[PDB]
Tab-separated table of C-alpha atoms and ligand atoms in Angstrom:
chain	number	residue	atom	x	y	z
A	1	UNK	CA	3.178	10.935	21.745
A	2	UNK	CA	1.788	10.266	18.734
A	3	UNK	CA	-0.734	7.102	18.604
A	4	UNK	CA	0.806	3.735	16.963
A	5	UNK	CA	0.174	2.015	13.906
A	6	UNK	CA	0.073	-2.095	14.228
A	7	UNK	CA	-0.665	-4.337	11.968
A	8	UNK	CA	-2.043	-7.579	12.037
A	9	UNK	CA	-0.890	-10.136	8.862
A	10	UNK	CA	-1.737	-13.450	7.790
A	11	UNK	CA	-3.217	-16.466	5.804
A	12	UNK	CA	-7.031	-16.666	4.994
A	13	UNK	CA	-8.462	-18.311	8.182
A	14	UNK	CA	-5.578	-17.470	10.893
A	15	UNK	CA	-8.253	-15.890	13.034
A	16	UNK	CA	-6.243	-12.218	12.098
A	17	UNK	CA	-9.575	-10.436	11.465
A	18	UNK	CA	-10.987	-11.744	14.957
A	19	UNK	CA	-8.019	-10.477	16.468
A	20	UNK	CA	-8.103	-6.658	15.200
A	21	UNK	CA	-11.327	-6.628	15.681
A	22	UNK	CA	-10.498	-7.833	20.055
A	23	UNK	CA	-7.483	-5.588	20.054
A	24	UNK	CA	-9.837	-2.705	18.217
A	25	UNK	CA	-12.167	-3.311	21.117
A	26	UNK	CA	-9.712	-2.831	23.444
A	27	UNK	CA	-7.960	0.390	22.968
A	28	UNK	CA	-11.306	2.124	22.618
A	29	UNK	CA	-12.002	5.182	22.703
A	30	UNK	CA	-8.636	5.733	20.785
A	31	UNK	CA	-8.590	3.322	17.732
A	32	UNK	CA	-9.523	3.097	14.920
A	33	UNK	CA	-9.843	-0.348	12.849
A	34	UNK	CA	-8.851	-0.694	8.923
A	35	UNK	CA	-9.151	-3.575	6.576
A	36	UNK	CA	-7.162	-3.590	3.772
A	37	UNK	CA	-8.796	-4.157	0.881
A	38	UNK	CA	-10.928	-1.605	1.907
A	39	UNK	CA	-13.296	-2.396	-0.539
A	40	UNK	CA	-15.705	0.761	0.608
A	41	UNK	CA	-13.743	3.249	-2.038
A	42	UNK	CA	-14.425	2.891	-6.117
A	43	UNK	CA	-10.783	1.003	-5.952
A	44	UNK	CA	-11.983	-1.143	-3.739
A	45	UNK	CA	-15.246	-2.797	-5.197
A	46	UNK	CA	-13.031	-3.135	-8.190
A	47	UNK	CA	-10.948	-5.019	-6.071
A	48	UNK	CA	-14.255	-6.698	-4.362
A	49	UNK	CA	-15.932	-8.035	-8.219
A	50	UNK	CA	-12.257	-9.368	-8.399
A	51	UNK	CA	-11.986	-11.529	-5.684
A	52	UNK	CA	-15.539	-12.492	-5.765
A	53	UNK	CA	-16.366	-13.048	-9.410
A	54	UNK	CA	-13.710	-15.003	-11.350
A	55	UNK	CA	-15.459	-13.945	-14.280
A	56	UNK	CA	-13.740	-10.077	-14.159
A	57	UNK	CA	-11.017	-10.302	-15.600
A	58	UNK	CA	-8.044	-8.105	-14.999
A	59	UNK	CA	-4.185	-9.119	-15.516
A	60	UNK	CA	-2.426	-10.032	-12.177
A	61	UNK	CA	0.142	-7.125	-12.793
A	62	UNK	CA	-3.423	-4.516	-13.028
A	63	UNK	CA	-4.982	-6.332	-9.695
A	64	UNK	CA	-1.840	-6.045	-8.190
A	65	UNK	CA	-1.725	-1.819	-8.899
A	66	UNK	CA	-5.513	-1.533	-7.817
A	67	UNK	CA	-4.531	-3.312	-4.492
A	68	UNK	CA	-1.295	-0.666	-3.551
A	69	UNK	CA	-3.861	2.431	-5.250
A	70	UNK	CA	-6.606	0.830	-2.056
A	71	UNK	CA	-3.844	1.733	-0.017
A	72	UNK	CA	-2.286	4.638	-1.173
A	73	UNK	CA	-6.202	6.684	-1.575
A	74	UNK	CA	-6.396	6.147	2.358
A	75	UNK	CA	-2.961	6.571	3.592
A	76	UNK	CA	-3.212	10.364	4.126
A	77	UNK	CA	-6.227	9.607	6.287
A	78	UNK	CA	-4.470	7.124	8.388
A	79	UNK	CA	-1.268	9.356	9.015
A	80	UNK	CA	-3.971	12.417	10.127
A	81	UNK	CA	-4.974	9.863	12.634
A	82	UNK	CA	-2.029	9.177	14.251
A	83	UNK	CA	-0.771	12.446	14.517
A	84	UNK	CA	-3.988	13.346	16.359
A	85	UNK	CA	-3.262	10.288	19.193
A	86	UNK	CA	-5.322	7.721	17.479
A	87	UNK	CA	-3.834	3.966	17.642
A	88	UNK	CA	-5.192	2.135	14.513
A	89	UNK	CA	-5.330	-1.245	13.681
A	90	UNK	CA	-5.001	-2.446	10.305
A	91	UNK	CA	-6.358	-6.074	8.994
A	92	UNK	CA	-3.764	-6.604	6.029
A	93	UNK	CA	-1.269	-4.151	4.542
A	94	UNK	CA	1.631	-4.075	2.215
A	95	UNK	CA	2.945	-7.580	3.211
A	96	UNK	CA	-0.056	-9.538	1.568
A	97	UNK	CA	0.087	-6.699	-1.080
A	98	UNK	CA	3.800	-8.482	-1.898
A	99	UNK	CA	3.068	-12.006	-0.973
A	100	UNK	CA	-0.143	-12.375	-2.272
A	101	UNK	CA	0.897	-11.425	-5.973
A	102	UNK	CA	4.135	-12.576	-5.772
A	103	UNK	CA	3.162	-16.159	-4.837
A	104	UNK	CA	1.503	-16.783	-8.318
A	105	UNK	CA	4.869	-16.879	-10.196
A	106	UNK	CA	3.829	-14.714	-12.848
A	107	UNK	CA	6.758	-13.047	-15.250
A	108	UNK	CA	8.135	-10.294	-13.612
A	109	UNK	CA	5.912	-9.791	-10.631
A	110	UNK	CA	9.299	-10.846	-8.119
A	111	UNK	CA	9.115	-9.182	-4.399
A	112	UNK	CA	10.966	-5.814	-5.766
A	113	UNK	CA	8.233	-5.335	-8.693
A	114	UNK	CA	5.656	-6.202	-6.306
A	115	UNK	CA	6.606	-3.611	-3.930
A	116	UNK	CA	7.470	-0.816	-5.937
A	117	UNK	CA	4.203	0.322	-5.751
A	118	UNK	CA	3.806	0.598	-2.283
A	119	UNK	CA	7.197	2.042	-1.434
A	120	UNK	CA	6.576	5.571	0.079
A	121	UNK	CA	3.467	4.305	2.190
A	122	UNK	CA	3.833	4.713	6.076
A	123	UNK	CA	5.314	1.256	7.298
A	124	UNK	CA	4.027	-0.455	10.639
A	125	UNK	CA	4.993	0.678	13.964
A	126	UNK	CA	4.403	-3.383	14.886
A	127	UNK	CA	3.676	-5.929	12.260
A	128	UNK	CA	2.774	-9.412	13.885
A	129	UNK	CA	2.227	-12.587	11.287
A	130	UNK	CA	-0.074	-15.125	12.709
A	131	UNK	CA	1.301	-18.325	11.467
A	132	UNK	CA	-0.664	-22.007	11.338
A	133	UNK	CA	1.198	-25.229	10.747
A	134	UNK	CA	-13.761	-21.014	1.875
A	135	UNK	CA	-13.150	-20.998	-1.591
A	136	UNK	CA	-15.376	-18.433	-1.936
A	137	UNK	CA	-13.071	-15.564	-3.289
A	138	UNK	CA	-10.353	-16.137	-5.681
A	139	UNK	CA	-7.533	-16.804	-3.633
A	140	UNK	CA	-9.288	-19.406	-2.002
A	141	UNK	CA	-7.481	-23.055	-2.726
A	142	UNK	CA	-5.282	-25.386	-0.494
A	143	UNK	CA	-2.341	-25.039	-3.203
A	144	UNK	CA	-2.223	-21.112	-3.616
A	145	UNK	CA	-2.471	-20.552	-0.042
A	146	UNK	CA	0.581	-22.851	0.596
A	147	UNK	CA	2.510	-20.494	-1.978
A	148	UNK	CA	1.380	-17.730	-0.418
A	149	UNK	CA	2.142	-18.979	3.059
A	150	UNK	CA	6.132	-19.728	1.787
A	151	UNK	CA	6.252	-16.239	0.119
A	152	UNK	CA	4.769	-14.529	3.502
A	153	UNK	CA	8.206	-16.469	4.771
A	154	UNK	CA	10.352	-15.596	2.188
A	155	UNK	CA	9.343	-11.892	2.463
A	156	UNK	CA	9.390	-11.528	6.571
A	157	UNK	CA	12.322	-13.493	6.706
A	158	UNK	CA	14.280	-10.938	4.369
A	159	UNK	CA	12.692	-7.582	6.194
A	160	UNK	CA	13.796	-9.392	9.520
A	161	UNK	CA	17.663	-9.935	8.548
A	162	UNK	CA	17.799	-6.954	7.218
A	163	UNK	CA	17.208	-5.464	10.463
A	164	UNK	CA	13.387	-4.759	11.018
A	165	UNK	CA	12.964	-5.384	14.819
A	166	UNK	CA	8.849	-4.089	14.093
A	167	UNK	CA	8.347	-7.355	12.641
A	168	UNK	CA	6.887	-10.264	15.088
A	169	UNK	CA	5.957	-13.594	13.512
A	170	UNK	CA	3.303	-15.338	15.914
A	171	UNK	CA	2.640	-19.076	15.659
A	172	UNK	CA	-1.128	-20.120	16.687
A	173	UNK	CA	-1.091	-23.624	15.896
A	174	UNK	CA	-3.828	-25.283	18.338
A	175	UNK	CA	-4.369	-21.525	19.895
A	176	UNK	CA	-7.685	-20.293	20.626
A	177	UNK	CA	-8.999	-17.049	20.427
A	178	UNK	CA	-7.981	-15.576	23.962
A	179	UNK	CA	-4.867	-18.161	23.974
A	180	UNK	CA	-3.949	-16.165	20.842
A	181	UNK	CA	-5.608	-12.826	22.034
A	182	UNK	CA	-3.121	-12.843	25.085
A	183	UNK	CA	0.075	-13.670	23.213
A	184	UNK	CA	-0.234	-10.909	20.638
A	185	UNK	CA	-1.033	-8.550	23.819
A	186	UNK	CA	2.024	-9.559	24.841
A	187	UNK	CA	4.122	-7.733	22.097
A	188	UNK	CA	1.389	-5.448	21.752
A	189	UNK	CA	1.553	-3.651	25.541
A	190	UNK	CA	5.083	-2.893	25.045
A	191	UNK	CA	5.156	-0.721	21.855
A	192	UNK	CA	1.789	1.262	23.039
A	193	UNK	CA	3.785	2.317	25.897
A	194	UNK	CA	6.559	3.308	24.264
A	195	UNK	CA	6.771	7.274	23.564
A	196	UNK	CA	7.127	8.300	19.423
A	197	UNK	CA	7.566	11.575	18.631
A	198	UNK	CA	4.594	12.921	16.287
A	199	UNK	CA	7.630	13.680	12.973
A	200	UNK	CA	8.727	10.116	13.914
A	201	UNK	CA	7.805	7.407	10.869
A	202	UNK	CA	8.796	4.893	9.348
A	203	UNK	CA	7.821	3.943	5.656
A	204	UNK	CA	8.269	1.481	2.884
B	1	UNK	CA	7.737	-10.677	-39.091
B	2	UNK	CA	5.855	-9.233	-36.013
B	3	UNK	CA	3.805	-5.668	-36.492
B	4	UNK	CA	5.194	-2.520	-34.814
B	5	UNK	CA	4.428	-0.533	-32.002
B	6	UNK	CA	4.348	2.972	-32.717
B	7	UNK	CA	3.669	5.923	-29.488
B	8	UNK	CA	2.715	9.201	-30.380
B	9	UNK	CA	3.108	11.423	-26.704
B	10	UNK	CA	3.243	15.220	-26.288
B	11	UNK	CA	1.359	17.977	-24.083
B	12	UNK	CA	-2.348	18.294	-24.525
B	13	UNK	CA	-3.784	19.355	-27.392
B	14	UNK	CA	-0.758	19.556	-29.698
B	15	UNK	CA	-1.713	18.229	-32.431
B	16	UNK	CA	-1.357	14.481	-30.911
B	17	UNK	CA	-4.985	12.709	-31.281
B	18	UNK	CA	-5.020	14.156	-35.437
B	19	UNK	CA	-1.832	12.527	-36.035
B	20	UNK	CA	-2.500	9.401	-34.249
B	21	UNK	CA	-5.397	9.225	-36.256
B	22	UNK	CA	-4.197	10.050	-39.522
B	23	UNK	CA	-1.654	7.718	-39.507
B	24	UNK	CA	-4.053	4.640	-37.869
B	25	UNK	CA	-6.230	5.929	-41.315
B	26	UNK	CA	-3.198	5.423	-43.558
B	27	UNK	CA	-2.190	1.960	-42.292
B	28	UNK	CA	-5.556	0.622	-42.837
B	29	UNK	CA	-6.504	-2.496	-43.098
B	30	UNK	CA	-3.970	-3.763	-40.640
B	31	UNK	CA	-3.605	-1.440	-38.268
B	32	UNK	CA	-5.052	-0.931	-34.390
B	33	UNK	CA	-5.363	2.826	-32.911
B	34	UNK	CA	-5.201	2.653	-28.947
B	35	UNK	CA	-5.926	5.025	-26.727
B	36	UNK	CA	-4.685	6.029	-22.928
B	37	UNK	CA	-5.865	6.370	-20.795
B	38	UNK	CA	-8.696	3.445	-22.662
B	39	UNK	CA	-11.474	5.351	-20.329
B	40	UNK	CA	-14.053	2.283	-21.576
B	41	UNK	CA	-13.344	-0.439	-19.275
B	42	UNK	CA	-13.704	-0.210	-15.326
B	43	UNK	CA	-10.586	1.393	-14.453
B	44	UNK	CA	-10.617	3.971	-17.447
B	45	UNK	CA	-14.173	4.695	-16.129
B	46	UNK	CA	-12.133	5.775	-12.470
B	47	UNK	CA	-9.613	7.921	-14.877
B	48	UNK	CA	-12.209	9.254	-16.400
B	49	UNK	CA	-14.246	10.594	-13.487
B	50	UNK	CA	-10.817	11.869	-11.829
B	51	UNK	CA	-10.342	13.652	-15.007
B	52	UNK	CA	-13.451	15.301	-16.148
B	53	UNK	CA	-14.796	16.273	-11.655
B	54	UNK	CA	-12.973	18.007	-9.498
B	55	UNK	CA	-15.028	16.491	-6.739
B	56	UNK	CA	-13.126	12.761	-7.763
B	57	UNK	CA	-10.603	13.176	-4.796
B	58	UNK	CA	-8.047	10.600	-5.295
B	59	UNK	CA	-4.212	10.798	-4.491
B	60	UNK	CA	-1.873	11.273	-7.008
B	61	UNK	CA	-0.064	7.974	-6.012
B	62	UNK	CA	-3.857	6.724	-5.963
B	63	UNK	CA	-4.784	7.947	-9.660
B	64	UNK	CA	-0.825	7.293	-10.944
B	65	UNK	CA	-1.312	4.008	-10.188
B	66	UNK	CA	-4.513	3.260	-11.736
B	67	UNK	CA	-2.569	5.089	-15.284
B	68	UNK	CA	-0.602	2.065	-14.720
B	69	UNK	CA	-3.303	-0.428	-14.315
B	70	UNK	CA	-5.199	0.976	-17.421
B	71	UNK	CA	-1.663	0.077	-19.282
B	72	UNK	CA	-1.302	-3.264	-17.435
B	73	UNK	CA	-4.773	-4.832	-18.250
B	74	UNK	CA	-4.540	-3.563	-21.921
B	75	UNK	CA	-1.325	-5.068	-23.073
B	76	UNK	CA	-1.582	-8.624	-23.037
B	77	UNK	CA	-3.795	-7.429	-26.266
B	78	UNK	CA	-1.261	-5.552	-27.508
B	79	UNK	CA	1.085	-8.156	-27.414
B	80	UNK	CA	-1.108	-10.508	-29.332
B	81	UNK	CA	-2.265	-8.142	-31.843
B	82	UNK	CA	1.543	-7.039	-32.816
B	83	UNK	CA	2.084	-11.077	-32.776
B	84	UNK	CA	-0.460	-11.108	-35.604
B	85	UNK	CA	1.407	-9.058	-37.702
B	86	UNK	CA	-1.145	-5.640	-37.297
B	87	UNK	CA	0.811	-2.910	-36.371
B	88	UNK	CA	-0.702	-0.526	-33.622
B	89	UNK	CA	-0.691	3.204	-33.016
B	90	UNK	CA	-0.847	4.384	-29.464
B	91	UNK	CA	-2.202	8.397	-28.092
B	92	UNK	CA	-0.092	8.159	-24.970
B	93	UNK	CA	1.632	5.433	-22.984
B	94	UNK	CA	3.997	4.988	-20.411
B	95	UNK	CA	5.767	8.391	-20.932
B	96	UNK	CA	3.029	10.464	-20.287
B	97	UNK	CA	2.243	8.414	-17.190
B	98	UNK	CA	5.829	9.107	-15.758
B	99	UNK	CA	5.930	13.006	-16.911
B	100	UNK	CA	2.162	14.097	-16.275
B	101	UNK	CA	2.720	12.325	-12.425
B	102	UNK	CA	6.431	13.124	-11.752
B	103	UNK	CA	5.562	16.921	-12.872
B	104	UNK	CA	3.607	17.448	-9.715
B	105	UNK	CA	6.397	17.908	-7.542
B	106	UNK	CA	4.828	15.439	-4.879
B	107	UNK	CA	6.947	14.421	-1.997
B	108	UNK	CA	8.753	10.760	-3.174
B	109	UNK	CA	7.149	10.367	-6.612
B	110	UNK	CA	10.170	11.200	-8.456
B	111	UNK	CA	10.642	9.883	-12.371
B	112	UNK	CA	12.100	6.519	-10.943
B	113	UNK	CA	9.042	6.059	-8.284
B	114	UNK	CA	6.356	6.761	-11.267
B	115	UNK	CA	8.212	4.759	-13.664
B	116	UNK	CA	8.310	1.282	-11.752
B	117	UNK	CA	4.445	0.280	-11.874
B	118	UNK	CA	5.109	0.726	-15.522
B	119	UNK	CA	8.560	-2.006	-15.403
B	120	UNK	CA	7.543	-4.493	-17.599
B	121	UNK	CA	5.589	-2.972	-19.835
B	122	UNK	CA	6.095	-3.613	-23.960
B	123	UNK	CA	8.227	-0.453	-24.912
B	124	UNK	CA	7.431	0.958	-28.250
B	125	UNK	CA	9.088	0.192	-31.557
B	126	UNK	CA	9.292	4.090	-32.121
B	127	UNK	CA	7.910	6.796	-29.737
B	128	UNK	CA	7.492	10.152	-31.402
B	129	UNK	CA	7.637	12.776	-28.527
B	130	UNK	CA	5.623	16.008	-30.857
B	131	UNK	CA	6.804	19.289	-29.172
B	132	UNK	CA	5.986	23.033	-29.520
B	133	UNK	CA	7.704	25.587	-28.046
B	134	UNK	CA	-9.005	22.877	-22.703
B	135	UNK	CA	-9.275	23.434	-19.236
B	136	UNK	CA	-12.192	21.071	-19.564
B	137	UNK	CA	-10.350	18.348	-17.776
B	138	UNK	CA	-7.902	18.301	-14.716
B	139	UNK	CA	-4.749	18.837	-16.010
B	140	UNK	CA	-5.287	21.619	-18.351
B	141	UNK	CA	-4.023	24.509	-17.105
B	142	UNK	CA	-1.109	26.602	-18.687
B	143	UNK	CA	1.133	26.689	-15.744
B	144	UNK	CA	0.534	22.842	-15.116
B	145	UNK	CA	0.956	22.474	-18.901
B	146	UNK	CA	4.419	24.013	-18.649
B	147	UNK	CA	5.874	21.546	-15.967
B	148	UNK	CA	4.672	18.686	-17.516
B	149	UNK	CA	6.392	20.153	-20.681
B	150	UNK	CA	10.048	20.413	-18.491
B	151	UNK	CA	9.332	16.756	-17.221
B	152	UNK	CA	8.721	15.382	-20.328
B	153	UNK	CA	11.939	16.559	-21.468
B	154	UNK	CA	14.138	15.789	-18.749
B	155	UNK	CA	12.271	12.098	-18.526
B	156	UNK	CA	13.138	11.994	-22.720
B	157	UNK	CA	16.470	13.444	-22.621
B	158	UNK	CA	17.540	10.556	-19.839
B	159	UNK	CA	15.895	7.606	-22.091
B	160	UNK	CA	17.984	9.364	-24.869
B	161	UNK	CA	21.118	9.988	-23.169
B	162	UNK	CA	21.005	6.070	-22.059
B	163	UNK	CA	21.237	5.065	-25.923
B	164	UNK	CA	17.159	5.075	-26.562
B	165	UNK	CA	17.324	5.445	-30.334
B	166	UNK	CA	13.652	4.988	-30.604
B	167	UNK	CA	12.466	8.375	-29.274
B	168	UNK	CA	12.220	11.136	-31.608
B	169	UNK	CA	11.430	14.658	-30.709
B	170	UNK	CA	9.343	16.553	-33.567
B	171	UNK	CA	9.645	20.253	-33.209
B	172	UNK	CA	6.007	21.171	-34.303
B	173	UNK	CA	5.593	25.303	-33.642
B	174	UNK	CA	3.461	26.773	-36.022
B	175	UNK	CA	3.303	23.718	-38.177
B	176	UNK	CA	0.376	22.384	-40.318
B	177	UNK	CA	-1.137	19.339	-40.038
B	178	UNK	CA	0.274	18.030	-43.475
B	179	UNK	CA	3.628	19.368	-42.310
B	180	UNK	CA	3.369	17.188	-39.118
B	181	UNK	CA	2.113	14.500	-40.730
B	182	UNK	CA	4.996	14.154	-43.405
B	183	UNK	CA	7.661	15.041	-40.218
B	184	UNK	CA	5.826	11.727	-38.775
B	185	UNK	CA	5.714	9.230	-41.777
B	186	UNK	CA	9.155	10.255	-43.017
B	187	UNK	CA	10.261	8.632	-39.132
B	188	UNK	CA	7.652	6.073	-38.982
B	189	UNK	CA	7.823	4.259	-42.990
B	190	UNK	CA	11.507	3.518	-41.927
B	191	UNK	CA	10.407	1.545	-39.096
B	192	UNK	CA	7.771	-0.257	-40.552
B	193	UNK	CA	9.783	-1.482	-43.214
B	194	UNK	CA	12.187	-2.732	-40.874
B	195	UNK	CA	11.315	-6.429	-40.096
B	196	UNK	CA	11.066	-7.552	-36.710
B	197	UNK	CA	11.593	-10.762	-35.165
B	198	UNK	CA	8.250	-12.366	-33.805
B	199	UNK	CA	10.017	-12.724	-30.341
B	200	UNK	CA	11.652	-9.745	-30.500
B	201	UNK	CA	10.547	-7.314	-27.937
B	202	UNK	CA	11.837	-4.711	-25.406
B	203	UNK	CA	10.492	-3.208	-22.265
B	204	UNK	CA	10.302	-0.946	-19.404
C	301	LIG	C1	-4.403	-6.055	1.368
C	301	LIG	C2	-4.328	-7.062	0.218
C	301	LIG	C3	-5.084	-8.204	0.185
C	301	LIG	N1	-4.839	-9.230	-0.710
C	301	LIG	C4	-5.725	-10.395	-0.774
C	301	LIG	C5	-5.691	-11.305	0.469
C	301	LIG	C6	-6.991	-12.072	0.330
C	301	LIG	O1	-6.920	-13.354	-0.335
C	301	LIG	C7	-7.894	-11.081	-0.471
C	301	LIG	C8	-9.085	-10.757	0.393
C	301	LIG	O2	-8.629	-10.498	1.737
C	301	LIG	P1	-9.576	-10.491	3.013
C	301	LIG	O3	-10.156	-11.907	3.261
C	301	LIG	O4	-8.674	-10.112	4.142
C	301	LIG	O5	-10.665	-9.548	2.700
C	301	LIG	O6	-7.063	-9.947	-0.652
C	301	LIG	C9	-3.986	-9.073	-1.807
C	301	LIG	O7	-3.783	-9.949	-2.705
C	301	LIG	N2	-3.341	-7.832	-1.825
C	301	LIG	C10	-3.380	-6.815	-0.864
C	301	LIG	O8	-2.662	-5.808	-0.999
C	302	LIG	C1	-1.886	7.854	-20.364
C	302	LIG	C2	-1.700	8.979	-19.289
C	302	LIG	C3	-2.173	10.236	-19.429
C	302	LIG	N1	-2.131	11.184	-18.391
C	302	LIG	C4	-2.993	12.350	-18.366
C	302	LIG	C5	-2.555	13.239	-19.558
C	302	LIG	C6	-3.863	13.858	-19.958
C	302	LIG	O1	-3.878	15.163	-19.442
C	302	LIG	C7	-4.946	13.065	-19.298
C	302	LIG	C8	-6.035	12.788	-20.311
C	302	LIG	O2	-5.542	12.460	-21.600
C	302	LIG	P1	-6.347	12.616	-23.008
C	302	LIG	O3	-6.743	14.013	-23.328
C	302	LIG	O4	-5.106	12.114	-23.953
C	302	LIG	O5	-7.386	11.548	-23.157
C	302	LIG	O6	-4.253	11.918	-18.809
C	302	LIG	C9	-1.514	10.932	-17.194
C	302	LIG	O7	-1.571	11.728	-16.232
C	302	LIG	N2	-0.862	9.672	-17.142
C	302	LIG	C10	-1.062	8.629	-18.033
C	302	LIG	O8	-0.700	7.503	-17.739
């Protein structure tokens, strides 16, 4: 049917970008690979002097609209993709979108504010979180990385009792690469060979 | 107590920018005029492309969103300027975000999707909607003109019929600019006499 959208989500240093990057190589011809931020567009080297240069400043609630705009100025080109039998793989999504900005515990910014934005977007055929047990972008620090670790949780835990089977939450504590490489195969295989009809989708 | 905040919306080239300036002359010294979209800083300078070329391809979730971002990485500013006791007059705001983006008829940005990047937001002390009843940038065409005229009304008449006393509609057909401006002040010198709690504030 039509090809399947999986995404890959989780910390800085998880190995997630390694991993798209293997499963990318692997369902050649038919895949594409996207990175969210996509930092490629206008939006996105806004986004790029951001994370790179403390110096810009830009309210979180402004960042936080740039990042769901990244998404939203592609998302037509991803859904023309599937439809024509490509599988893509994406390297971050909606899920940091939320966690990321919702982890700094600024006024307002909650899960539902920090979603908002994003609602409408085409959601995941498969989401997998890679889950452990620098310091050169913004982001960057021991202590904000724990937040955003907990709100990841917090997040994915709610989506997951409320019923989204798509969501797999993958633990590669003192994994290696293929170690890691074989268990996301695992609940990969299954959903690539499972027929969706081209007006079959899911979204946010 | 704390200075005011005082909107100005309506269709494109209605009289709107005069008005706003006239009565940011008459407040003088302690008054701020504001503009949106504020095309000067990085994300204006996207607006501003999107708006003036036709080759700018962005989605309208895309460009709505950056509206919102504009808003969002102004208003800390605002905030501290009204907390200094200057009282600020703004050419567009939130309204015109919702109205200009909801009057496209895209599939799922509805009033209540295009109003939520906005939640938050500093709501004005009194929004004057002026009403009648070009083509050098993207939205200036008569027939576009004329939706976001029904959209603006609708998104108005909701805000009104939920006990908004703040918004005003000034008929302005055929009206001078001395007639407009006297329609404005005799709205406006009410509120500005009115003093307003340093905390007080309400939002979006
Ligand atoms: C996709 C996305 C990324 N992020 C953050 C995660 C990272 O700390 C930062 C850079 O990500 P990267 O290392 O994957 O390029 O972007 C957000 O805060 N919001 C989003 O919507
Ligand atoms: C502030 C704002 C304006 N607009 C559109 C209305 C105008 O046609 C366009 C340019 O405005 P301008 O002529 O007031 O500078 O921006 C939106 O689409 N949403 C917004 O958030």
């Amino acid at each position: 049917g039509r090809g399947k959208l999986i995404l890959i989500e989780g910390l800085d240093r998880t190995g997630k970008t390694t991993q798209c990057n293997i499963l990318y190589k692997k369902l050649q011809p038919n895949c594409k690979l996207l990175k969210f931020p996509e930092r490629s567009t206008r939006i996105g080297g806004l986004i790029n002097e951001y994370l790179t240069d403390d110096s810009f400043q830009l309210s979180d609630q402004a960042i936080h609209l740039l990042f769901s705009a990244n998404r939203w100025e592609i998302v037509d080109k991803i859904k023309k993709d599937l439809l024509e039998g490509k599988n893509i793989v994406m390297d971050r999504y909606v899920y940091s979108g939320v966690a990321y900005s919702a982890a700094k515990g600024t006024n307002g910014m909650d899960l539902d504010w920090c979603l908002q934005p994003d609602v409408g977007l085409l959601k995941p055929d498969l989401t997998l979180f890679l889950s452990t047990q620098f310091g050169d972008e913004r982001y960057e620090t021991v202590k904000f990385q724990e937040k955003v670790k907990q709100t990841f949780m917090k997040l994915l835990d709610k989506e997951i009792r409320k019923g989204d089977e798509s969501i797999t939450i993958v633990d590669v504590t003192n994994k290696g690469i293929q170690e890691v490489e074989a268990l996301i195969w695992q609940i990969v295989e299954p959903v690539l060979s499972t027929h969706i009809d081209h007006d079959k989708f899911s979204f946010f």
